């Protein structure tokens, strides 16, 4: 299957004397592995998964220096945007970036990503060709022209096709055992009267990674109506939780089954209300 | 644009020097570099934003000031002999790999005693009749002698216009004694061009010396920055 | 970290100039060259990323050799106006540029039809002031240096009257002696 690396960066300007807050988070296959935060007592990139302990001090020092450069880049970019949009001095504004690569199991780049948002709206993005830009509004046309003129896409392309790919591959080799780790969901169904109707709620607890699917069915057909799902949520101890519910007739509860699909399981779980 | 001021500075040892840089690039980053006998670009100080500064690789003996986005100054509180060098300012955009845009440089000489600063005598030697008759060419020679320090720029002007074709100027001043440099240049024209009395030839030596910042006593001429020229007309002789 | 030799180089007009550089840090991935003319500041000439082997722009080509950690700059049909100091440089990521020490390049013609001669010139605004001009001599000959206090001989200086084809080597000699003939001093 594929693999991915992403860096998600945010800079938030602050109306008083403070410089913008700058945070950068790296992910490999959607697992956080490094983080930098300008508000930390000692602002530096830090490992966030145990396999990043293979990197020497040079790695951390130079990545930290890179973040310090990004911090200035974001500061200037925020100030420039303030002018482009004619915004007043004493507000707070958010610039975000997503960058990275998707890599096949043959180590071929499938897609590179380099895009930005301002105030929660898409701003500019590098096209799939890694050569041209899509700009969302008037301000972003200014940026687009500046980057076309300076040849910025060529430099991003080099990062995406070279460094992004090569480092992802190194991280996957060092992180393999950790990246394969799973914790299986523990599941059960609860019963909650609701008018001759009851809510059946199928719980999945203590699972890792977060990816999971819960389904309800009746008489071999998967349900969609009368259904409620909560967003998958952290327990706070590194594992996750989720539930899914259906509203059913009083007296027919046992006819309904919940299925839990998760990569940790040797096969999907099937369960029923069992009072 | 990136412009530096002054173009040249002569200071006394233990004197104060401020070199100024002004940019119109709206760039956040500014830099001061040192170059020694035309080699190297060593970073002294830089700045990532208006109103702050950062130490470069060779900060010792220098301080920097960034009072606005456009301005970045290099300050030598007690100029030493070791600070004789050429200094270049630059700007760049914030981020990675952004091109440095440099100013044209400031040449600094730090001297024990400013009474040694002396402008050149400029002499224009007219072409040999032997060259004219045998080669149908006429080489004029300009000699600047007796100047110190060696902050000179020599240019040729024919009929009021600066010329580069037919000129060779010594790349380096010739040191005649401790406090005396010489420089030569030649301009070659055709014999018929030299023989036309409508044609005007001028050797201009731009000497950089003291400035209005320097006090000078009543006794003698102040050896200030100045242009000194020697001239000759063509002649049908 | 960026090693650039030689300090100075002359190559003949029309020849291909080869300037080389090496670097220590194998992670360096961007290599800009800057050109600096006498009396001016450096300016960006050409640059190359480590993903590429070469970058060409007119008469200038940079080549990048990752295995040997070597860069070079080739200038075809080298011409007098390419006379300048060339700085190689290197950086990783968004780190600050590191410059080499710079190579000073002089492009000179090798003169085709030399007709050497020595002339005496007079300063008309002087009582008795004269100098010696050695001109139109072969591009391979060493200009003699002063073997004498109070007499000065300059290095070879090449000019080009671009009016037509009139390139010429020259040197000047002068003295504080009151008995220096120009035929003595240049032989």
């Amino acid at each position: 299957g594929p693999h991915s690396m992403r860096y998600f960066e945010t800079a938030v300007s602050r109306p008083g004397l403070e410089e913008p807050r700058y945070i950068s988070v790296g992910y490999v296959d959607n697992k956080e592995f490094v983080r930098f935060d300008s508000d930390a007592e000692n602002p530096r990139y830090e490992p966030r998964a145990p396999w990043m302990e293979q990197e020497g001090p040079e790695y951390w020092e130079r990545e930290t220096q890179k973040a310090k450069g990004q911090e200035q880049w974001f500061r200037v970019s925020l100030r420039n945007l303030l002018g482009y949009y004619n915004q007043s001095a004493g507000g707070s504004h958010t610039l975000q970036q997503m960058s990275g690569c998707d890599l096949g199991s043959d180590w071929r780049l499938l897609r590179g990503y380099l895009q930005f948002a301002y105030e929660g709206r898409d701003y500019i993005a590098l096209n799939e060709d890694l050569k041209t830009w899509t700009a969302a509004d008037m301000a972003a046309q200014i940026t687009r022209r500046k980057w076309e003129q300076s040849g910025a896409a060529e430099h991003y392309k080099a990062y995406l096709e070279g460094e992004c790919v090569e480092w992802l591959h190194r991280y996957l080799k060092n992180g393999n055992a950790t990246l394969l780790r799973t914790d299986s969901p523990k599941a059960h169904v609860t019963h909650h009267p609701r008018k001759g109707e009851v809510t059946l709620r199928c719980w999945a607890l203590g699972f890792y990674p977060a990816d999971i699917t819960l389904t309800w069915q009746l008489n071999g057909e998967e349900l969609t109506q009368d259904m409620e799902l909560v967003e998958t949520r952290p327990a706070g101890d590194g594992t996750f939780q989720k539930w899914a519910s259906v509203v059913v007739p009083l007296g027919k509860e046992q006819n309904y089954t919940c299925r839990v699909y998760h990569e940790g399981l040797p096969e999907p779980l099937t369960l029923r209300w069992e009072p | 644009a990136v412009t530096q001021s002054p173009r040249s500075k002569v200071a006394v040892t233990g004197g104060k020097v401020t070199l100024s840089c002004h940019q119109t690039n709206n760039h956040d980053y500014m830099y001061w570099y040192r170059q020694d006998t035309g080699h190297g670009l060593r970073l002294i100080h830089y700045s990532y934003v208006a109103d702050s500064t950062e130490k470069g690789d060779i900060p010792d003996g220098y301080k920097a000031s960034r009072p606005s986005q456009e301005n970045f100054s290099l300050i030598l509180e007690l100029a030493s002999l070791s600070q004789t060098a050429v200094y270049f300012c630059a700007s760049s955009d914030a981020g990675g790999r952004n091109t440095l845009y440099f100013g044209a440089g400031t040449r600094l000489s730090v001297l024990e005693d400013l009474r040694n600063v002396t402008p050149p005598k400029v002499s224009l030697f007219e072409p040999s009749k032997a060259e004219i008759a045998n080669k149908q060419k006429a080489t004029l020679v300009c000699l600047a002698r007796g100047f110190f320090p060696d902050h000179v720029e020599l240019s040729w002007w024919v009929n009021g216009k600066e010329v580069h074709s037919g000129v060779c100027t010594d790349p380096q001043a010739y040191k005649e004694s401790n406090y005396s440099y010489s420089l030569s240049s030649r301009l070659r024209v055709s014999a018929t061009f030299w023989h036309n009395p409508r044609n005007h030839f001028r050797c201009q030596v731009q000497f950089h010396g003291l400035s209005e910042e320097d006090k000078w006593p009543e006794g003698s001429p102040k050896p200030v920055t100045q242009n000194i020229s020697a001239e000759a007309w063509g002649r049908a002789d | 970290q960026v090693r650039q030799s030689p300090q100075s180089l002359t190559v003949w007009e029309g020849g291909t100039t080869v300037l080389t550089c090496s670097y220590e840090d194998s992670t360096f991935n961007y290599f800009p060259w800057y050109q600096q003319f006498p009396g001016e500041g450096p300016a960006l000439l050409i640059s190359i990323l480590s993903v590429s082997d070469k970058k060409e722009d007119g008469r200038f080509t940079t080549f990048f050799n990752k295995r040997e950690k070597k860069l070079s700059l080739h200038i075809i049909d080298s011409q007098p106006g390419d006379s300048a100091t060339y700085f190689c440089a290197a950086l990783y990521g968004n780190e600050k540029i590191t410059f080499g020490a710079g190579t000073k390049l002089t492009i000179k013609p090798n003169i085709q039809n030399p007709e050497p001669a020595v002339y005496q010139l007079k300063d008309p605004r002087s009582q008795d002031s004269t100098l010696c001009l050695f001109t139109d001599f072969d591009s391979q000959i060493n200009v003699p240096k002063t073997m004498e206090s109070g007499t000065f001989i300059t290095d070879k200086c090449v000019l080009d009257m671009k009016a037509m084809d009139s390139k010429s080597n020259g040197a000047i000699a002068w003295s504080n002696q009151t008995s220096f003939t120009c035929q003595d001093i240049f032989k």
Partner: peptide
């Protein structure tokens, strides 16, 4: 390793 931006916006 993280990306690094070039020209500012």
């Amino acid at each position: 390793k993280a990306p690094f931006n070039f020209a500012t916006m």
